[PDB]
Amino acid sequence: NKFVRAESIVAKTLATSREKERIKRVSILEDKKAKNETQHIASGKDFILKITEGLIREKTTYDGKPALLFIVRVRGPLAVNIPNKAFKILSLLRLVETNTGVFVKLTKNVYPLLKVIAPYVVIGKPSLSSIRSLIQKRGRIIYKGENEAEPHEIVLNDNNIVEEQLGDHGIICVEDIIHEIATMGESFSVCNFFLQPFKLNREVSGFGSLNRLRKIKQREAESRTRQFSNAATAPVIEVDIDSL
Amino acid sequence: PYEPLIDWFTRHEEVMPLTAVPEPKRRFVPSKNEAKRVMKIVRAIREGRIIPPKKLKEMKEKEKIENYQYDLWGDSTETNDHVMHLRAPKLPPPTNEESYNPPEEYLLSPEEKEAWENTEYSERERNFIPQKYSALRKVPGYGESIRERFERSLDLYLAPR
Amino acid sequence: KVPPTIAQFQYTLDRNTAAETFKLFNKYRPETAAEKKERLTKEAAAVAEGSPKPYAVKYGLNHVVALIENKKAKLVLIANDVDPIELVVFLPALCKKMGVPYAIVKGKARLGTLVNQKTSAVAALTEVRAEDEAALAKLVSTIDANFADKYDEVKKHW
Amino acid sequence: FITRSQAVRKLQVSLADFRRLCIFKGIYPFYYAKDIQYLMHEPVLAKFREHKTFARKLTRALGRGEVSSAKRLEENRTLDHIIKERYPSFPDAIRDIDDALNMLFLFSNLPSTNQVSSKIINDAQKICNQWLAYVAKERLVRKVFVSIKGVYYQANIKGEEVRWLVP
RNA sequence: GUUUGACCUCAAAUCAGGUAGGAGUACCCGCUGAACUUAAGCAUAUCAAUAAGCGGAGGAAAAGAAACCAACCGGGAUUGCCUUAGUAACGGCGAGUGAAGCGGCAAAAGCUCAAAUUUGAAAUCUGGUACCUUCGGUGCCCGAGUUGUAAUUUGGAGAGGG
RNA sequence: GUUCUUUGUAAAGUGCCUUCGAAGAGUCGAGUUGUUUGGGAAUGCAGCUCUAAGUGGGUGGUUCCAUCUAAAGCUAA
RNA sequence: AUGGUGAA
């Protein structure tokens, strides 16, 4: 319906070209690292950056230990059409939906994949209390409804539903899922699929009179907190994801 | 009467300005106005009639937060009986066996459940479906709590008295 | 019909060129009363306890006119809806005689938004940073072909 | 006797603000003519109109394109004295606190959404936690009742026997 | 973009901050304004550029610092008196009408704007609120103002610099 | 007469050199209609009709010379 | 003549 301006499409093309150039280099570097081509690379090892509150940064070497992680969509870059290489990864992880989240388990192979799509999302280690609150106060669950259709992803209304769906691995209540998510249990993958999305509440959701100023303040604070480094060797940036 | 204008004069662009006023020093140096204002503000700060922003930072983020630190009611032993227009809040009465584990005699039968479901809103004085749940986990989730309490809030002050 | 001098307005900067000019002008918003007051108070507090000229757009009619005829101003904006039209009839011809490029923009209210004033009826810029000097020069060059060459017969259309 | 329309016309107040004032004054409905005359003097109405004017000022500042002016207007901006007259004594407030406790408990469990600010939910949760800590320290609870709609908790604060529902 | 915001024009309020009516009226500043009455006559001449009529101020008012008067070897604001002078001048040159410079005295204060960009910072002012030492002093807010509030300056020049 | 601030790289007083260095328009005035007039050269006032320029304009002068810069405003005696 | 009064 709306007419497309030349400037907008040109900007989209330029941003897409820049992102594709970055992604190709990132993929080549990751493939070389997987092949142990340490002969000539910027950094043999990898780091994970952390930003905390006045504002200071922290950097630590990557440790080969799995840990529960939560990832949320950041709705950007603003004018970049997601390339198929990253679009497939986002679709598989089902984080394409704006403001949607999902829990994943950190692994040696997962970390390089996160590095490629790190700018597109925000990652971090949520606290146990935050995880429990989110699980007991949010989370979609796909099931077959009464008899016919399966559009009812609203909420974990009844514990008996969890017993019925699985029944075998002892997952009879929400607390079982919470324990299996916090702990490195085998059922983490099973319950992770059971709760594909985590539709966290979005921002102010409007413009209004004061809401416009609030949105502007949020946008300008995002640049002072989040930043598109675009470096192929950019360390993963961790933040206090629990602040929500 | 109606003919196009002529650019006989505007045709030739001017080469040099029309004035040779010497440039004042203020055009290349900070003017006295800023220094005078700064000195006036310094005098005000010294005289104590104005405060620097450094102390205002504390006054805004380390002061005015001390609120509610006073006895709102204090010593008081009298009621609104002076004016009898203070209608009682009509708080809900105690429960009527609407428990998760009520007596087995109040276990709604399928016919009773169907009859209750047939009745619509505003005619459900018995607004609960009693049932027995020997296990706490078996208790189903309740989503109608918000609606019922919203209706109560509406009826609190949206009814003639 | 209107005289030849009138109707020289109603031909103004286009949406794209006007938007670009506003974007360039929006980068040189003069310090407002609150900003100047807080800056001066901070400076006084620093002095009590113990930079080049601030580039900004010129908008005052008297100041703008004084800048014109001296070749100091590099660009001038003219409001088309000025109620005392006599105040603006001579500005385009005077600028053309002085060879200073100018671009007419619709709306005195819109013009004033860039200087935190209800209405100014005029706007111009003389000083410009290096990062924006190239943009200003390109905008000035584009305005020439956009306006002067497109309305060389403005003397017509009584 | 006057009606809601007459009260709104005389007070020159919005419907939402009128409802807020009625709630803060308990003006149950037709409307009490003798009480609307007393309502004519209300600093809360002055604050509401000042906020309404500030909203227009902020919209103007945003339209003019001045973030600093908007920030200054927003930064440069209560029910404490209202409670003085609608709760003559502490026992009355304790008796009427049932609805307040129920509302706070209900809202504490409400997930954050666009229609409800997350700050409100956080404040409600903090208030509920404070109330729970106070009850535990004083051990004033006497009975517990479990229901399909929650647990019908009750307290005997000064013998009130208030019954607050925990969702 | 079928919304939304900037403004500009004019209304609405037993909203806040403000002023005028009238009286008095000898004199002052303007408008309108006749007749009896007279030389032998009424359109100029004369009652009269008056009384009455109308509008607006003070204890005094108006005027007041030249687009002045003069022709000399020049004076240097306005105003009142004597003189200039019952002269110059006007009029069936008669009857009658009727000025001014210069001179002397009383008193002599001269000034403020438009007309040049502050532009390296509308820095100006009213109003509201909060305090004080209240014919006023200050923190904060809004509005007025850029179609112009702020340094001098009315030709005796003045301004930017050394 | 006795005191507090005297502040701030502020104001402004004077000798010499350099560069700039504005001026009041339906206004003056030509004609006409009524008025003022002691007014021989309107001396003015109001309408009507057109409207002037800055090495210019106003009032006088004997060939031409003498003096100011209206069309903005304030001020006790 | 100017300023006013009321009415077969």
UniProtKB/Swiss-Prot annotation, chain A:
Modified positions (Phosphoserine) are S205
Q: Where in the cell is it found?
A: Nucleus, Nucleolus
A Gene Ontology term for the protein's cellular component: preribosome, large subunit precursor
Q: Which UniProt keywords apply?
A: Acetylation, Nucleus, Phosphoprotein, Ribosome biogenesis, RNA-binding
Does this UniProt record's set of keywords contain NADP?
A: no
The domain of life is Eukaryota
Extra info from the record?
Present with 7720 molecules/cell in log phase SD medium.
The protein's job, in short, is: Involved in the biogenesis of the 60S ribosomal subunit. May act as a specificity factor that binds precursor rRNAs and tethers the enzymes that carry out the early 5' to 3' exonucleolytic reactions that generate the mature rRNAs.
What name is this protein filed under?
Ribosome biogenesis protein RLP7
Q: Which organism is it from?
A: Saccharomyces cerevisiae (strain ATCC 204508 / S288c) (Baker's yeast)
State start and end of the fragment within the whole protein.
Answer: 53 to 317 of 322
From Swiss-Prot, chain B:
Question: Which top-level group of life is the source organism from?
Answer: Eukaryota
Q: Where is this region: Required for interaction with NOP7?
A: 27-145
Localization, per the record, is: Nucleus, Nucleolus; Nucleus, Nucleoplasm
- Family assignment? Belongs to the WD repeat BOP1/ERB1 family.
Role description? Component of the NOP7 complex, which is required for maturation of the 25S and 5.8S ribosomal RNAs and formation of the 60S ribosome.
* Assembly information from the UniProt record: Component of the NOP7 complex, composed of ERB1, NOP7 and YTM1. The complex is held together by ERB1, which interacts with NOP7 via its N-terminal domain and with YTM1 via a high-affinity interaction between the seven-bladed beta-propeller domains of the 2 proteins. The NOP7 complex associates with the 66S pre-ribosome. Also interacts with NOG1.
What remark does the entry add? Present with 2680 molecules/cell in log phase SD medium.
Q: How is this protein named in the record?
A: Ribosome biogenesis protein ERB1
Q: What organism is the protein native to?
A: Saccharomyces cerevisiae (strain ATCC 204508 / S288c) (Baker's yeast)
Question: Taxonomy-wise, where does this protein's organism fall, top ranks first?
Answer: Eukaryota, Fungi, Dikarya, Ascomycota, Saccharomycotina
Q: Its encoding gene is what?
A: ERB1
Curated annotation (Swiss-Prot), chain C:
> Which GO molecular function terms does the record list?
RNA binding; structural constituent of ribosome
**Keyword Hydrolase recorded:** no
Report the domain of life of the source organism: Eukaryota
Which example biological process does GO assign this protein? maturation of LSU-rRNA
Query: Sorted alphabetically, which keywords does the UniProt record give?
Result: Cytoplasm, Ribonucleoprotein, Ribosomal protein
Keyword Hydrolase set for record: no
Give the GO cellular component terms, alphabetically: cytosol; cytosolic large ribosomal subunit
Cellular compartments annotated: Cytoplasm
UniProt lists the family membership as follows: Belongs to the eukaryotic ribosomal protein eL8 family.
What is the recorded function of this protein according to its Swiss-Prot or TrEMBL entry? Component of the ribosome, a large ribonucleoprotein complex responsible for the synthesis of proteins in the cell. The small ribosomal subunit (SSU) binds messenger RNAs (mRNAs) and translates the encoded message by selecting cognate aminoacyl-transfer RNA (tRNA) molecules. The large subunit (LSU) contains the ribosomal catalytic site termed the peptidyl transferase center (PTC), which catalyzes the formation of peptide bonds, thereby polymerizing the amino acids delivered by tRNAs into a polypeptide chain.
**Remaining remarks:** Present with 238000 molecules/cell in log phase SD medium.
Give the record's subunit note: Component of the large ribosomal subunit (LSU). Mature yeast ribosomes consist of a small (40S) and a large (60S) subunit. The 40S small subunit contains 1 molecule of ribosomal RNA (18S rRNA) and 33 different proteins (encoded by 57 genes). The large 60S subunit contains 3 rRNA molecules (25S, 5.8S and 5S rRNA) and 46 different proteins (encoded by 81 genes).
Q: What is this protein called?
A: Large ribosomal subunit protein eL8A
Q: Which residues of the full protein are shown?
A: 70 to 233 of 256
Curated annotation (Swiss-Prot), chain D:
**Physiological role:** Component of the NOP7 complex, which is required for maturation of the 25S and 5.8S ribosomal RNAs and formation of the 60S ribosome.
| Keyword match Methyltransferase | no
Q: Name one GO cellular component term.
A: preribosome, large subunit precursor
Whole-protein residues included: 15 to 202 of 605
The annotated subunit structure for this chain is: Component of the NOP7 complex, composed of ERB1, NOP7 and YTM1. The complex is held together by ERB1, which interacts with NOP7 via its N-terminal domain and with YTM1 via a high-affinity interaction between the seven-bladed beta-propeller domains of the 2 proteins. The NOP7 complex associates with the 66S pre-ribosome. Also interacts with NOG1. May also associate with the origin recognition complex (ORC complex).
Please provide the Gene Ontology terms (biological process) for this protein: maturation of 5.8S rRNA from tricistronic rRNA transcript (SSU-rRNA, 5.8S rRNA, LSU-rRNA); maturation of LSU-rRNA from tricistronic rRNA transcript (SSU-rRNA, 5.8S rRNA, LSU-rRNA); maturation of SSU-rRNA from tricistronic rRNA transcript (SSU-rRNA, 5.8S rRNA, LSU-rRNA); ribosomal large subunit biogenesis; rRNA processing
Family in the record: Belongs to the pescadillo family.
Organism, per UniProt? Saccharomyces cerevisiae (strain ATCC 204508 / S288c) (Baker's yeast)
- Please report the name of this protein according to its UniProt entry: Pescadillo homolog
